[PDB]
Structure formats: structure tokens, C-alpha cells
Design a protein around this ligand. Sequence first.
Ligand code: PGT
Lengths: 173, 64, 86, 55, 122, 459, 166, 128, 20, 156, 165, 172
Amino acid sequence: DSWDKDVYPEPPRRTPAPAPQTSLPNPVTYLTKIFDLLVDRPVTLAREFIEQQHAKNRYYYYHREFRRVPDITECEEKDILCMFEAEMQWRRDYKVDQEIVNIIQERLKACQQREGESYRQNCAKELEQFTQVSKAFQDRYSDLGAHYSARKCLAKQKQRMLAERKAAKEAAA
Amino acid sequence: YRHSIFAVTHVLIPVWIIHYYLKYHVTAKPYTVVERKPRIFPGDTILETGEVIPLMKEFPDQHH
Amino acid sequence: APPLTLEAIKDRVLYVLKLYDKIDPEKLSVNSHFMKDLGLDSLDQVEIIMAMEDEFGFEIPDIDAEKLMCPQEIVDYIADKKDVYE
Amino acid sequence: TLCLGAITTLFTALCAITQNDIKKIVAFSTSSQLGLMMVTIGINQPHLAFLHICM
Amino acid sequence: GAHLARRYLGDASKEPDPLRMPTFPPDYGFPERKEREMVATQQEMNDAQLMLQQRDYCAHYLIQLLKCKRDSFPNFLACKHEQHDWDYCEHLDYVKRMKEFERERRLLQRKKRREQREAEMA
Amino acid sequence: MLKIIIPTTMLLPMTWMSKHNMIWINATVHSLLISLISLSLLNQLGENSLNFSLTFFSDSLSAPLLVLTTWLLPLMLMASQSHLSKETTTRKKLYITMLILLQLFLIMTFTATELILFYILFEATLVPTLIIITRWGNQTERLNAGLYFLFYTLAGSLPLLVALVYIQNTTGSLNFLIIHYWSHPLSNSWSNIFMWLACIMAFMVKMPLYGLHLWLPKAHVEAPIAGSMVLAAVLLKLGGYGMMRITTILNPLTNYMAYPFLMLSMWGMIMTSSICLRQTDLKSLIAYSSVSHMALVIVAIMIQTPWSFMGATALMIAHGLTSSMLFCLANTNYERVHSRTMILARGLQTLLPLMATWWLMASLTNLALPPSINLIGELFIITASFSWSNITIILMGMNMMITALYSLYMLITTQRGKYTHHINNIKASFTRENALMALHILPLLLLTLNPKMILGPLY
Amino acid sequence: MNPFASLTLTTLIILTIPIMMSNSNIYKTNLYPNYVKTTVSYAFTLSLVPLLMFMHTGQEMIISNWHWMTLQTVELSLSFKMDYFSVMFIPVALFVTWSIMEFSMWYMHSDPFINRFFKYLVLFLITMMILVTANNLFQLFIGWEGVGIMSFLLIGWWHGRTDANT
Amino acid sequence: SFPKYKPSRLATLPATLDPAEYDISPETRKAQAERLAIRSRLKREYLLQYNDPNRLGVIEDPALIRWTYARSANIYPNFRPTPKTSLLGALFGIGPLFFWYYVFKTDRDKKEKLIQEGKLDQTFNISY
Amino acid sequence: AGGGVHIEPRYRQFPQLTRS
Amino acid sequence: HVTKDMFPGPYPKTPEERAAAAKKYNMRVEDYEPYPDDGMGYGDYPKLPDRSQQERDPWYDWDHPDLRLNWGEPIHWDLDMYIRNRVDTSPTPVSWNTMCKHLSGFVAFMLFMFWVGEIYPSYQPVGPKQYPYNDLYLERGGDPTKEPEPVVHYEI
Amino acid sequence: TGFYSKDLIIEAVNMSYTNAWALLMTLIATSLTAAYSTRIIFFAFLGKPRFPPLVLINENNPLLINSIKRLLIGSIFAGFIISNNIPPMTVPNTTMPLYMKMTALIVTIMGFMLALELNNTTYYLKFKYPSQTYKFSNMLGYYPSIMHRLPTYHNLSMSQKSASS
Amino acid sequence: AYLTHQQKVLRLYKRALRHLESWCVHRDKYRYFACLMRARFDEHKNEKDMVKATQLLRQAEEEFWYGQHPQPYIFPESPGGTSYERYECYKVPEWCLDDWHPSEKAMYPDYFAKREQWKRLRRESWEREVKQLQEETPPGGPRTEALPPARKEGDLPPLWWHIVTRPRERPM
Ligand SMILES: CCCCCCCCCCCCCCCCCC(=O)O[C@@H](COC(=O)CCCCCCCCCCCCCCC)COP(=O)(O)OC[C@H](O)CO
């Protein structure tokens, strides 16, 4: 398959075997039958023709990979030469994290139709995974402003353990 | 005849391209055509793995 | 609807005045000016043009209602208001 | 929802029985129906509402 | 029924409020009562795509109804006995409801008159 | 970069040295060609702005406006060769020189990398527009209108000059990249408020908000067709571009100082759209509609939310293209009737059947009917504003309600209804007018398929 | 992945053809009303097969076709959701308007702009079956005014009638 | 007898129940005698330019351009600052602006008061 | 409204019908 | 063409310029009432009766039948409020005060005692829905780890 | 047709914990639903001709006949097919006290009787001046006369007098 | 002009019966009540006191203003009726036909040729009919909107073009 099953976990489909008892003919079976030899097969014959043509002259393309670069928490103050790599790397991880939330959202939406009337309890795992990701996403990038920058992201984060450690001191008592 | 060519150029070839679009582009991406699991009932077998799920337990005998 | 023509209007017009019992049929003329020769009261003239109004299905404005007086002139105002020319 | 459907049912029907144009009568009859539809969706009857849509 | 008038027009303390009952414990007045034994486990009722408001005790008389409809297709005149069987169970469930409703109703004013009996003697 | 600038300025000798009657042709040939080259510029990278040199750079915000300006350039030439045909060749060449010189400044301004460089041609755009409004304007009050338009922006622009040079002497360079990377938290010292006020009011004036918007009705109405579109389809957006660049060094002062402008804008749109509901002049009605849409952007930009920025650019392109079309609509029927009163020429659909269609889809786009980009812009702003505060939807939605009435009000009053009997000079619409109209509306629907192109840098 | 999913979507693409053919203006300027009526009739007949597939099995689709545009964590996509509600509203709405289409020819046997009239009905018809079939709220919002504006033009069919505009 | 129909600014009194023309005078009827004259004086030459074969253009109504002028330009030159205009301008000016400022301020004063103390829920709110 | 109409109208009379 | 002086001017003080303004709007001085000098800049524009275009006689021939207007007559300052499409002023058969009285009474009576209808709701004498598996806790989104409190229904 | 939905609905809303006023509201509507239905059948069909003398009555066009009949045969069965075919996906109430289970039929039959009696009261020679209730109901329930004239005037008057000017 | 009293009562008589028709609906009732309404009209026909007739008129319409049907009966073609200017959107002025392209004009040669004749008559008739108007115009402007006919022979009545060439009421 083109995509990955681990990224998009699909529970096995439980399709019942057809076992009718009424003597009169079941029409739907016939509609699928006359669809098969009128639409499905001619589509397949054209498809197998394009696929063999595609494999006749196959050209390749790869996926661009960016190596790790020093980010903004160790980049020297001012020194925008180091800030550039820091900012670009952080913004790249922003898009990746946005896609990560997207991947979870489709999985959560996929459960809805997949589980039908069982959606409420069957995929509570999907709900908590999104809840865990969404909460963590909020601590990462939420309320960064329309002019968000890695400096602000570090600034917002640095407040988080500031309050957390202050709470830790209070909790220790 | 006027019904035939109308069927070919308005029913036949549209579902042709839609099927090709669905079977090899839309379904080529995950979670694009998501189904409801075919509901199964106690005592109905499923062909993918073969075994029948157990028959539902015998009723408390309610009759009208 | 078939094109209603002036011969159709007058046939329908004098039909109703013949119907109107105070306008007895024998002295009906296409140009029978009502109160001068039929003696028909003007207070009933405002009553016959609404009889015309339901006869042909439309409204006759009050400005020409009191002006709509002669049975030929009844037809005359009917024709142009519905561009009846044939 | 069922409150709005309830008031809609009268006022549309109440004005319906006094109009003199068929188009006015029929439409007020419709709005009385859609008044009734939301009464169903009022007390947890969505499926019957959609049934009423079909009929 | 008539309890609406008995509640509002009459005294409201003698009508069990539908938002309140049951109040008295089930065992109180019911020595050795029997629990509702559900037959279809949560598993089968779940994957049958059964809607939550239908996920009651009588749903066991609904699950096979869909089974009959599946093989009944295209015929829709079948399942008459099963449908009659299903709603008859709902009738059996339903008759229990006002049994419980008037159980509290016949219980609560009993305490009221019992209370007056055990209060006016002093 | 230079692949668009030099062809634009090199176009100027062409018009001046072209044949007597080919000036409209040859200018139209390459003005379209420039847009094609600018369309190649529309590509943008992931996060780093497409940087060319110290003098010029482009990002995901400048490029959609750049292609909009170059795409516009043929349209004024198309829309102007009707009321200037009976003019001497030198004045026609001088007129054409004004637009392309104007269009040159817009390209330079959006591509500018330094705020001062942005500032210099930020004011330079007015000199050609002032000439266009005054000289070739066809009215009497254009003289006062030109004065109002010129002095209003200058009264706001000059404080920006003192503000910008202050940043230069305090934080070194004002390059957009360096100012964004070295941003510092602006304090709440009572001087910083006036620092904030100067850096903002300049863009506020040429982005008409309630109160500072009286130049727009007189400028739009009195200017000729070409002047009206350029001042309404790109010029108002100059203020919009300024904010997205300049609020980088106005936070967190923007959090608290936004209230008086937000209150003036959100209430202003209801008031201004109400003016549209009872306008006697068709051009004025379109002009006031521009105030309402722009006032919607004011709330969008000042909120400083990722969603708000994305809808800001979306409404930015959509409103400009739509307002340009509507000004074409008002211009196309004006010389036929030689007046601007809306009710003078009623029932135009019966006489002109296609103009009914063109005016129809113009109304729907201005309606923010989905999925037109106007809807994407407005709907995005609603959600961003709603997250900012729940109450604003009452103001936000009511604007859409009022927008429905006045947008269709011109349609019913002019297109539909009984044709006025006395007029008899309404000739069948020239194919130039029809072609110019499709030149506007068609790319709008084409943009519906790819909103990502005009969403902006926040995307 | 039965024909259910594929041909329930092609039902919609059938009714779009009369609009595209009309804009060519080569379209039959005489028997256009007959053209569209028969087109809606076929769309109705096609719409049966998803229905008969439903009461037998009970499967309801979600067709997340071409991805319009992604907004960080939002993935606004043209997506059709063939619920039981949508799988049955499609046939009945088509059946009614097909009946209306036959009646419309007799009633408007003299309207000079009859071809424009039938074109408006389809555009309304298109806007609704994308309203009922709407997996995302945005395309549900698409019909919610697409049907409204289509109602405005159709209501003001007699443009001159001042009350009709009102 | 039903007591009469009291009119209103939105539902005016019809001419059928208007006492003025029911008590006409040996003067008022003569007032409504040149009414047709001026109306004809306005109608006659209008049709003359309307029916003129050589006429190729519009028939500009001096009343029409007067209305646009009086509603567009002839306001400020005839405007005079008076307490009625002054109060009305302030009431419809700063009034609503400050009112909306107060409403949004308190709403934006209640919103953050919830989240610094963690009294509001945005577990799934990310795309702000 | 041309000649040959099978629903030929009438004046003040019951209109003609058909078995169909 | 209109040059200068038939353009509207300022509010006429005395009858001499009142008469000129009456001619300025091609109307007699006895029917030229300028708007009150409230200072709102109405100028010398005449106050015309607050009557919508709907009240004009349709059977009369107008040079603008859609607006029911002749040529050159002074049109209302607010023609775009009282146009046929927009706000009307035609006399309704019943009085406006009664028009509002009955309507306001209806909605108030409808709404007010709807509330007391909520006070005394209608319900059959029926118990609650006895649901299995401790009121369907697990299948209603309840936490499987958090064991539901024992809920079980008996028979009566 | 309507039995498979409306009769179920009226029974359903009665058989639930609802607002007492809201439940009574549907019953009056259903009785009023028959009321105007009789009005149409009475005035339009059950009477004497009142149209202009030239009668052009015609329905023999196959386009009308085919269209109406196509919809007619659908209405005849309609609910029987849908209700029997769709899976049982609502909870069916069973034990209805007969007095209220007939209400779906009682009110409409009741509404038939008075509406018929009120309609042929027009046949009676007596004439009555308009009752104030009729002056209210016939004018679209007094809504358009006010709420389309009062708010429209204020907002428009605000736009010109205030605001712009 | 002078809306004299006798015109008022006729207008009262006409509209009241129209309202009365909207009430009785059924023809026998309408005929019955019209006759009694007729009788109570002409019974008081002998009043030398014209003021008393006005006083008898003053309470008349007031009862009508109560007796008015809230939804009176109007034939649809009339103002307020359902078919009011329904076919206006189809009728287009004749002068617009001059715009037509020569190929379009070539599609209808003889009718366009007949149009040329109409253009010819309206040209010289305009000067003739305007000359007649000036030579017989009453002093101090026209007193009534009524228009004089063509006094002499051959010439057309003044200002005839727009009324004669008015688009037909049923243009399709
Ligand atoms: C038509 C009127 C203007 C229209 C509206 C324009 C915007 C309103 C505000 C206008 C401000 C103009 C001057 C701003 C220049 C840049 C300000 C800046 O960068 O901030 C300085 C703010 O400092 C100022 O004092 C700036 C000027 C404040 C306002 C006084 C002058 C402006 C108002 C009057 C002139 C304009 C009005 C029109 C007159 C005809 C920071 O310096 P500082 O004072 O913090 O210096 C360090 C230390 O604290 C002491 O220096």
C-alpha cells in the first residue's frame, strides 16, 4: 500500500458473509454485478494500460532531508547568523508539529465513521491521544502571536518551567 | 438511440472517470474513503477469517 | 388563450347589456348612449362597467370608468387596453 | 426548539385559514409543517423528523 | 394521565416527580427482589452498531430483527413476528415503568398517612 | 527583483516613442506580459522570504499584491480608452505615463527591504495619483477632493517619518529581516504610546477607518475610472502591507493600545455599511463599501492572530479586485447616462442583458458569498475575532447582514425594475467593456481553487 | 470500496453537465427543458442504487476527495458524507424536482427565457445536494447561501415586478 | 360604530377619512385648480423633449439634481452648530464607541481573569 | 392557441372533457 | 442645463426669498414649507408630506411609473426610504396602536405562559429508562479504569 | 403518507416529558391543519363557478398528467415503503392509553367538522361584520404590517438623518 | 381636477361593492346584498342640502373603513394583483431596436422597412404637431394635462408617437 499502516492504524474490517433466506432475488447483488462488467473492468483495463506505460519509463524523486542545526536556546545573543539557522530549524519543526496534529486529527476523524454508533467508547484511545497532543501543542506554540518567532517560543516556554518550578517549591514546602 | 448516446455521454463516461479517480487517486490516500464497519450480528460468520461469532444466549421466553 | 378580437368583444359586450334587464334587447344598438336613449341611470353605469370588468377579467380605472359610456366605446376602450387590433 | 416549533405551528396555521390565495394557504401550511418538524427534533426525535421531511 | 391534575390542581406532594423517583430503596417493600438479567453482552450489542437509546434490555429482541431484515431484503413484508416480538417486550418493559411509577406513588402517600397516624397520637 | 522593475520602467519610453494610435495597443501588450513575469514571482518558499538583495525582497504577503498590481495595469488602459479618445496624443501619452510610473512605485514599495525605502515610495505613490485625480478627473469638486486625499495621508505620514528615523538612531538598521530578528518588548512608558501612535496612524489614514475616512468618498467619486480603481484596489492596501511589516516592533504595546482603533473600526463598519444603504451616488456607494471591508481588515490586523493575518490578506486581494470591478460597473453605465445618480438609469438588465450577469456576480463576490475569496477572508476574520472575544460576532455578523442589503440594493435599483423611458442613448455594450469585466471576475473564481496562494506569510 | 461510494458521487456530477453545456451556448436553445428533465431523471435512477445498497447493508460513506487547502491543524477538504439522511434525501429530492420539471414545461410554455429558468433550477438543485451531502461544515455553509442566492434570483424571476424584488 | 382609525407616521390617515376635502371652501378648490396647470406645465414640455425625434439623450430633471445636491453637498454650508446637532452628534458619536469599549473591556476583563487562575477550558483549542 | 385545439373553450358552459 | 441658481440654497428667512425658493422647486409659495432650522443642514429643501410612493394613485400616468413620479416635480428628501421597494406608509385597515397592541399582546401572552407551561410539564405516569450495565457507563464514554458505581435494576 | 410520520409524531410528542403548553400546541395545529385543507377543497372545488364567463379549463396536457400522476402514486404508498425498509432506528413506544393514541385522528376529524360547518355558513344568507379576530388572522397575524415597517423605517432614517448626514 | 361629489359617491359605490363581493363570495349572496346596498343608495336621492349629503357621506366610508375586507379581491393584472407588471420585464422600448446589428436587421427586412416609414412620418409630423400645439396653447401654460387632437386633416394628433408605439401589454 502507498501509505503506512502504522501511521494510519486500520482495524481489520468485520464484513459478514452474505447468507439470505428469502427466495426472491436480491437486487443489489445484480447491480454490483452489472457495474463490474460495465464500469469496473473497463476502468481496470485502462488502469493496467497506464501503469505499464508508467513503468516503461520510470523516473525517480527523493525526499529532502535537513540535518540538525543549532537552535535558538544555545545561539548567542544578537548574532543573527546563528539566529537564522535557529529560526529556520524551529519553523521547520513548527510545520512538522502542525502535520503531526493533522495526522492525529485524521485518525480521530477516521474512527467516527469507522466505529459508527460505537464511536463514543470504542476509540477512547483516539480521543486521549488527541487530547495529549493538543494539550502539548498548546504549551508549545499556542498564543505565540501572529509574529511568532523562536525567541517568543523560548520565552513562553521559559515561563512554563518558571511557574512549574515555583509550584514545585510550593509543593515541597 | 437518443436515450443511448445520452446515457453514454452523461451516465456512462462520468462514472468511468469518477471510478478511476476514486480507485487510484482518492483511495490512493489514507482515510479518504472511510466506511462504517459492516454490522455483524450474533451467529453471523465473516468470510475474511471464517469463524462464526457465537450464537446469542437463549431468551427468557417472552411470548404474547 | 386564443387571440380575443373586437368582434369577440362586441359579441360579449352587447350580450351582457342584453342580459341586463333594464336594457331590453330590442333597442340595443352598438352606439346606444345609455341615459340619453336607454334612460339608464348613471348610478347604474358605475355598476355595469364592473360587470364588464368581470366579463373580461381586468380593472377599469375610475378616471375613464365614468367616461366609458357607449357600448361601441365600451369595445373601443377594451381593444386598446389589451392591444386588440386584428 | 419545540417552543419555537410550537408557536410557529399556530401562527402560520392561524393566518392560513383566513387567507384567500392558494399560494398563501399552501405555504402557510408548509411553515406549519416545519413548525411541527422542529417539535419532533425538540424531544429527541431526529429520525422521525427526517421521515417527515420525506413525506 | 390524571396524575397531572392530581399534582398541579391537587396537592403536589402526593405525585412522585418524574425527575425524582425512585427514592425509596428497592428492597424496602420488596423482600428478595429479582434483578433484570440482560442476555446480550455488551460486546454483541456494540458491534451491531446499536444506537445508545436502543441499548436497553429489550434490545435483545431488536438484534435478531435486523438479522431477519438482512435476509428479508429485498422483501420488507417479513420480520412481522420478530417486530411484534420486539415491541411486545417493550410493552413488558413499559408495563414495569408505571408499576415502578405507581409503586413510589402508592408508597409515598402511604408514608404520608402513616406519618399522620404516627404523629396525631401525641 | 529587477526582472519586473526594469521591464516596467523600460515600458515608459515605449509609450512615449510609440506610434500615434498604437499607444493603447503596445502598452496593453506588455502590461499583460509584466503580469505574467510577476506571476512567476508568486512562488514562495517554506519560511524564509524570497530574498533578492539588500534593496529588494519578497515574501508570501508581497507577492500576491505584486501580481495584483501588475495584473491591474492593463485594466486601467482597457477602462480608460473611452473618455480619453478625444484628447491630444501628448496628453494621452502623459496619462499613460502616470499609471506605469504609479505602477512602478507600487512594485518598488511592496518589494522594499528597508522601512525607510518602503517609506519613500509609500509617499511617492501620491504624486501620480494627485495628478490623475485633478487633471483628468471629470467633475468640479475634484480639486477639493485632491486636497483632502493629499493632506490626510501627509498629516499621518510625516509623524511616521519622525518615528522611523527614531528607530534608526536607536536600533541601528530598519531592514525588515534585522528588525524582525532583533525585536524587543516595547515598554509601556508614556513616550512609547506616542511611539506606537506615530508608527500606526500613517497606515491608518490610507486604510480608511471611521473618522479618518472622509477623503475616500470625495477621492473615489471625483477621480476618473483609472484613478478610482488604482486608489481603491491597490492604494488602500498600502496601509495594510505597512502594518504586517511594522507591528513587529509594536508588541506588547499593541495588546493594550488596540482598543480605541478596534472600537472605532468595529462600530465604524456598521455605520459605514449603513451609509451604503442610503447612498444616492453609485460610485459613493461603492466607495463607502470599501471603507467597511477595509475596516474589517483593521480589526483583523490589529488582533495579531495567525488566523486574523491569513484572512487579512485574503480580504485584501478579494476586496481590491471586487471594488475595481464595481467601479468598472459604475463607470460602464456612467457615460451612457452622463450622471452618477443611481435611480436615474433603472432597469438596465432589460436593455443590456450581459451587464446584468456581470453586475450580478460582482454583487455576489462583494456579498462574501462562499466560496469566493471574500468569504474566506471575512469568515477567517470572524473566527479570529470570536476567539479574541465572544461578543464581537454580534458586530461581526451584523455587518454581513447589512452588507447583503446594500449590495443587492444597487442590483435591484439599477439592473432590475422598469427601464426609464426618456433615455434613448443606451447602446449595446461594447465588447471592450464586457472583456474588461471578465478580465476582473474570472481570476477571482480561478483563485478559489488555490486560496493558499493569497493566504500570506502566516500560512 | 463498492460501487456505492463511486456512483453515489457520480450522481452529483451528472446534474452539473446541463450547466456546463448551457454555458457553451451551442446547447440546444429550443429543447433545453427536455434535456435537463431527462438528465435529472437519470440522476434519480442512479440515486436508487445507493439506496437499495443501504437498506440491505446499512453502510454510509464519507468521501474525502481532493484536499482543498490545509490550515495548520485544520485540513479543510471537499468531503461528501453519504449518511442515511443523505442517501435517501437524494432520491426523493430528485424525484420531486423531476416531477416539477415535467410540470414546469406545461406551465411555462410561453416564457421567452424558459431555458434560463431551467438552468437556474439545476444550479439550485446542485447547491442543495451539496448542502445535504456535506462532511465538513464549510461546504455545508456553501449550500446554505448557494441555495439562498439561487432563491433570490428565482423569486425575482419577473424582474419588473417591484413587489417580486421586495 | 367602531371608534375611528387613528393614524401614525408609518400608517398615515387615508384620504377617504380626511376631513379637509370633505369641507371644501370657495377658496381651496381654486387652490387645486392651478395644481394641474403647474403639473401640465411640467408634463407638457417633458413629453415635448420625450417625443422629440431629434432628441438623442437624457431628460435631466432639475428636481432630481436638486435632490442629489441637497443630500450630498448642501448640508455643511447649511449646517449650523446647535445643541440639537451637538448633542445628537455626541450621542451617535462617542456614545456607541465608548459603550462598545466598556462591553468588550469587561468581557476582555473577565476572559483572562479565568485563564491565569485556570478557570477556563481550552483543551482542544490550538488554532487560535 | 392555434386552430386544432382539442380543448376548444366555451362561453358560460361546462367545458368539454375526455375519457382519459 | 441647470446652471447655478436652481441648485438648492440656504433656508429662506423672509417671504421674498421664500417665494423665489418656491419657484426654485416649481411650486406655489402656499405649498412650499422648508424644513425646520434644526441646524442639521436641510437648507431650503421643501418638507414634503411623509407619504410613500405606495400611496400614489397607480392608475394615474407617471413619467416614472416604477416610482410613480412625473417630470420636474419636487421629489421627497427621502425618496429612497419611501420608494415602492423600500419602506411603505400605506394606511392599514386597522389602527397602528391596535396594530401594535394585538401583536405585542399575542407574543407576550404566548411567551409568558409558555414559561408557566414549563413550570408544570406534561408527562405520563412512567418511570425511567432501566438501562443495563450500570446505566451504560462503559459505552457512554465512561473511563474503563474507573469502575462504575453499582447500578442494577430489579423487577416489579 | 402523512400517517407514517405525523400520526407517529403526535403520538410521540404526547408520549414524552415535554412542555405542557408545547404539547397542547401541536394538537391545535393539527386540527387547524385540516381547517385550511377544507377551506381549499370547499371554496376551490365544492361550489358553483365564479370565474370569468369564458371557460378555458384544461388539464389534458400529458405533461401535467404525467407529472401529477408520477407524484401521486408516490404519495399513495410513500411511508409504507420507507418505514418497512429503513432499519428500526428509533425507540417505539407501545403501551399508549387509547384516549391519547386516537388524538392524532380525533383532532383532525374534529377540525374537519367545525371547518366544514364554518365554511358552508357562507352559504347561509346571513352577513356579519368582520370579527376583530378575523381582522387579526387574515392580515398575516399583524406581523408584516408592523415589524416590516417600524424597524425598517428607523434603521433607514438613522442611516440618512444621523450617521451619514 | 375638481373631484366633484357625484364622482365621489360613484367611486364609493364601485369600491364598496367590490369589497362586498369579496365578502359574500357566493354569487347569490353577492347579488342579494348588492341590491339592498343599491336600494339604500338611491332611496336618499332628494337632498337640496348638498352639505347634508356630505355629512351622510362622512359616516359612510368610516363604516366602509371598518367594512373593508382586509384582503379585498383584485384582478391580478391590476395594481396589487398577482399579475402586476409580470410581463413588464419582457417589453422593451422600440428605440432600442435601432441599435440592432445590420445582420440582425437583415433578418427582418420588410418590418424594418415598415419601421423606416414610421420614422418618416414621425419626423415631419413632429414639426406639424408641435406647430399646432404652439398656435393653440392656452395662455399662461397648459391648464390641464388633456391634449388636443389634430384639428386639420392629414396631420397626426400631437405627441402621438409614444402612446401609439407603446409596447403591447403582452409582449412575451
Ligand atoms: C495632525 C496631528 C497628528 C495626527 C496623528 C499622528 C499620530 C499621533 C501622535 C504623533 C506623534 C508624533 C511624534 C512621534 C515621533 C516618534 C516618537 C518616538 O519614537 O517616541 C519617542 C517619544 O518621545 C516624544 O516625546 C515624542 C513626541 C510626543 C508627542 C509630542 C509631539 C507630538 C504632538 C504634537 C505635534 C503633532 C501635532 C500637530 C501639531 C500642529 C521616544 O523618545 P523618548 O521621549 O522616550 O526619549 C527618551 C527619553 O524618554 C526622553 O527623550
